[PDB]
Symmetry: D2
Subunit: 407 residues, 4 copies
């Protein structure tokens, strides 16, 4: 009961004691919260395997651009595997090809309702003003994740993250564009500033390479996946291991298993406190409500925080304070339900039933929707405690948290 979830190590008084109390016999029981991004290719274009992967852990499917009809088949195939169904949104990410001369894209971008763009070779804020200009007012609601992959981008990181919705640590290209021995510095720096900023961050490429042609990963690759979770990454990735390789689902299986283990061994006591000291005061009532709900979640070992949101914003500001409790986001928007897979700890649930006449009643119905999905999916049992986060009228106005026993 308290033996699980690394709770003994979560209550240590120092980072050092915490490490010494990590218990291989303590079982992850929380839902796995770090999103897996799988890169689509041959081994993963079967509507068959997409069913097998989406059960294995996939949350985002990545469309690398290195033909349009090829990727449009990919799209419709993923989508069919998603709608065959516990229903689990799955977002679609377009990873632009970008400039190339060993160290177009507007067509790929204007090109089907993608949820995310991993823009490539980003180096300045203007770059992001491009991709956002090109996406035009019709492409606004899409999420720009600037890939950082060269020295110039590392050094201008603050101006890039400023305008971006998120960041990718493009380790493949960085390990050539800068000494390989310096990559870990770039990674940890960037993950830390993104957690500080509350904007999702992605660790990527070669994380489970050997699994391209083996069923079991190296020791280094186990450690590498854990440590990206420990660093604070929102999403971890798979490239060849799912594009062009013999173990697409054993891969997604083991990224799920590893991240489930690493997430429990996060030292929240220190992470939360160091966000209390580094984060500026906020006067946004939604952020204020979120830090309140996370603190309450911890005080009672909440099973989940159930938040209502339309744009995904409320669930993001919960995610930035890293609750152990799962963030059960209930939304009528269907792109929101896919785009929040960029924020660690958010499980989306899409409410399709229509509005109700009294504002109060519509909210409860969505909230009980979350409780029943949660009950059925293993998050909630009865006599559990949860935190509930809603508004008073219909995203900006999200300013209420309630403590509720599950009945």
């Amino acid at each position: 009961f308290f033996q699980q979830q690394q709770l003994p190590a979560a209550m240590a008084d120092t980072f050092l004691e915490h490490l010494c109390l990590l218990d291989i016999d303590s079982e992850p029981v929380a839902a796995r919260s770090t999103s897996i991004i799988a890169t689509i290719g041959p081994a993963s274009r079967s509507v068959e395997r997409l069913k097998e992967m989406i059960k294995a852990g996939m949350n985002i499917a990545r469309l690398n651009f290195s033909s349009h009809e090829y990727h449009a088949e990919s799209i419709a195939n993923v989508r069919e595997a998603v709608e065959s169904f516990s229903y689990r949104p799955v977002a679609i990410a377009l990873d632009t090809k970008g400039p190339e001369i060993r160290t177009q894209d507007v067509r790929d971008l204007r090109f089907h309702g993608v949820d995310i763009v991993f823009a490539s070779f980003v180096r300045k804020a203007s770059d992001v003003a491009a991709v956002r200009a090109a996406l035009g007012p019709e492409g606004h609601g899409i999420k720009i994740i600037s890939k950082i992959e060269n020295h110039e981008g590392v050094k201008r990181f603050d101006e890039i993250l400023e305008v971006s919705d998120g960041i990718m640590v493009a380790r493949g290209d960085l390990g050539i564009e800068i000494p390989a021995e310096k990559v870990f510095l770039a990674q940890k720096m960037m993950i830390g500033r993104c957690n500080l900023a509350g904007k999702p961050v992605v660790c990527a490429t070669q994380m489970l390479e050997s699994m391209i042609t083996k069923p079991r990963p190296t020791r280094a690759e186990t450690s590498d996946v854990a440590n990206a979770v420990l660093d604070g990454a929102d999403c971890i990735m798979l490239s060849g291991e799912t594009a062009k390789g013999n173990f697409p689902v054993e891969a997604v299986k083991m990224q799920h298993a590893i991240a489930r283990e690493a997430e429990a061994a996060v030292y929240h006591r220190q992470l939360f406190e160091e966000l209390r000291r580094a984060a500026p005061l906020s006067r946004d009532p939604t952020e204020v409500t979120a830090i309140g709900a996370v603190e309450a979640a911890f005080k009672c070992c909440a099973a989940a925080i159930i938040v209502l949101t339309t744009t995904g914003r409320s669930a993001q500001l919960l995610s930035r304070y890293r609750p152990r409790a799962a963030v059960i986001a209930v939304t009528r928007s269907a792109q929101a339900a896919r785009q929040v897979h960029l924020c660690r700890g958010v499980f989306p649930l899409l409410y399709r039933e229509p509005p109700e006449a009294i504002w109060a009643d519509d909210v409860d119905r969505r909230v009980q929707f979350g409780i029943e999905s949660g009950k059925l999916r293993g998050f909630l049992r009865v006599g559990d405690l949860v935190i509930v986060v809603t508004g008073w009228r219909p995203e900006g106005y999200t300013n209420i948290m309630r403590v509720l026993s599950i009945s």
Copy 2:
């Protein structure tokens, strides 16, 4: 301009040392004074019009000290307090509840009568005999002292000390015997008759209550006092005697145990457990232990009361020289400020308001000081340390309360508005020492008085008619809070407040937290 104020540059410092260095005397303490002030009522503060003045200066608890005065006397003080308090009842947004406390005389040990209003000098070195034989009860020598505590010969060993006359005369036990205790005079001095006796380090087996305290406490219950400060609390069994003296009608009376001697300090934890709160009674404590040690007992007791979430009072000689002078000494202002920095929920005035010449100015100086000192509290470290030391909880009131205080710090909330019927939610807010004012709306005149014991809690008494739809009755009370606070200065338009309420009526909870723009 917001950052100039309430020492916010010092609040953001990364260490305590640097927090001290960034303290700024031009940073005005805009927020409202949260540490409650206890004024002992007497000749100098009994009259109604004075009391009105003192209330306005910032008195929050009136203290009736039954070491002196008749019951007819304190009845009239209680009477006049209530008249002063209710004179402001006509303006509900500004009405200031005021608690009443009874401070018991307590058991006592006294010497005999001499052969005489006469006097005699006990000489250092000289051999003095302390006897409980009634012969000498009127035949007090310079070498024989009679005492009205028979078991003094059972409870001071060889090597123990006997202190007479407010601690000025000291005596050491050399031999114990059937005629009495053989002493040598250690601190010589002049004793009169029926002087005060103190047995340092003894376990005094006197009753938790004297016969006068049962009469005084019965009087208390009959007059509806909110608070008993119980003298000479040495053990849990002493506080249970006090509760039984309060009888059936006194279950709701807060019992604040006075820790006044070595035994009570060492049994602190067991006393705090069955007490509602604690008074650090430095006056008798300073006679019972070495004076240079009282500051250790103060900070230990305040530290533990903060850990336990229970109100703690610092008492006696805080602005003592203001009994005759209109301005205090530099030690006195520093004492009040450090009591607050330490963590005290209340600070007290005894003679300064019961019998001196500047009672109103003495209330005003504690107000001004407490207000500066609250602002200089290093919340970054205190909030963290109270957070981590407190246990996990599945009580939704506790849970919401920590959430609410966390949210207040994030936005520098002007207030936290809380609906409570007992006070308990306000108290669970207060135990985390928010910087934001805890505005506590209640319908219970008792609760409104009693939560003055809790630092940070401004009680508002709501008299208006209940509304049929409960969600509407909640809103009107939150409004009452907002509008009371606007006009008292706690809240301005633009400010953010956290509001804490229950989900449904008589669910016994507060489990709703909202963030609201004014």
Copy 3:
């Protein structure tokens, strides 16, 4: 290690993981065994002028004798000085227990001076409705909205018109105005010179009679301490200037004053007239914090035990004030009328010693040492590096003493600024330095009068041995104790670069 180990000097509270827990484990039965380290300044007067009385005060703990030059003649002070030195030297026949005692000179300072009852309105400043002040630039420095206090801050007036003919004020607080009463100008940049003509004569008298320390009144800016240094002149180059911060501008320009002063006095007396009484504690805690961070000594002054002028025991606020001054960081605590004029001078010294001793043990060194080191800049000064290593070594082994050889006192001060619990036993041949290091908390100075030995390693050794025996004799040190010894590889300071761990034989 033992049990009786942790049942004294508040060691259970020393090792708590938080400040809050530290507070909770403070124990009134945990005796302080360490020697009292916070020096006591006793203001000299009729109550404390006789040689016999001063011996009693030395034995009760007086470390610095303060000479208040607001009153009394040079000849009167020359007599105080002679009796102090007579009483101090009466103990020098025992080299292993002789306590140096510094002499400080507190300057009168600049002064603005003036039975009608100014009431509830309208006075002009240039009897009953007009006040004339001997400070012509009053009209120049008190703006419309500024204030003028008169007589101990009893009366206040508010400027409403700076006219050709002076300043038209309204009476804010009325009372009885007598003749030539002190005036204060809260918030003003008072352009009086750093020094008065009387001070210059007093400073000269001070150098001529060999005083160790100057408490310089009403210091507002760096230029003022330069004038005091100027008036002490080159024969007073070795005298310490402790700047009295007494008014709003002093507090606001504290940094620039600290940087050129040898230390600071928090002069709470005139500060509570010059700023709201309720704000002094803020100025006290900020000034002590900044002095502690800079490693420069800070004195806490005025009314600490005020009631003992007539009573044999202090009030509860008074012992509280003394303990909290120590807990704040103060290097020195001070007695004015309690030792100059009252009826219990010796007892007032005794009470300060007793409170300080208890409060020293209640310091939360775990947090204090962590914050002084994280906040102090890196250093390339071998004497500073060695000091911090030695203080760290002393905590690791709860050493009984740090024994340091110092000629100017500087090595001892650099140990003091990291606030060791271990006593800093400072062995010197300079009688003045040994008087002066009493400004530094935790420093017990030992004056060594034996002539040097021709070989340097042997001279170092005999002075270390003098410190261990004195320490044994006075109770600092028992056989088996560990001490940390701090010396140099050669003559000088900046060459104090050796730390040794020693078992007392």
Copy 4:
């Protein structure tokens, strides 16, 4: 502060992640990590290379030394072959004994085959370190120690923690061993592969507390078995084992039987160097200060004193005179940023302190002086010349010098601050 930039120049403080080192939180420390900040401090996480077909040449072993191998590992899972290996090592090491100021001790470890006679082979081949395999409880190591017997008393027992039982009875294992190896290869078989980092970070932690060497091993740079360049996951693994606290890191088939055995060592070296500069010492030192118990051991006291002083002046090195290596170890436990430069006469201690992160052992050949103090000053001056020649030390540097008042290592109790000339 201006003396610091006058003395060292402004650029000094942009290097070795000093801007991130002064951060008030670990989060902000991470945000201040900088790929342009260069790791000027010598690389101090020792490298263990397993010897094999690709690493037995007398002339390859020279490439591995100049590349940074400090401990030669002998995997016993045939004698004629291993005594041949031991011989190639010693030939290779001694090719540089012509110039003592630059001679690099190298140690030799025997890693047991698993589940007695291999040890006494080791013993009287003069090996320095036993990597006991499959240890599960205290008696398994007491058994090992007994087998080594009297000729193997001076030999260091490094228990390999390979299964669930040894992970769970780890305290008592550690309580008796000289150190610990986190055997990831077998341990990823004997426990779920996703729980291994847990065992890892947990064991390193407890070893850091105990002041006892801990080694991270197996598959770190595996892809370099057949490739000249490592995986992104694999550079991260190396960096992260340093950040974890590991004293030592090891190469298996990167050097035994692979095509790039001198690039694998080279790469372990460059990663470790960057990662050491990246350690958050402020928090690490404090936590080890707060956990380490009060000591009346003069050598302990003097070591923490000297570590504190090294941080205060960012000293180029701490120079320690040690015979058993105890003093260098008690320095290593507090994880200085400054190089620990360990001058010893005992050739076996000079090889064995490679287990202690931060220690750079130098072997002193010259004969006693008559005067103890003269002998000390000549040993210290050797460490300084060795350091200047190798570029640890420049004129103007400050070093902390740790020595003894009289001969013997229960007598390390003097600490000196010194300017290199």
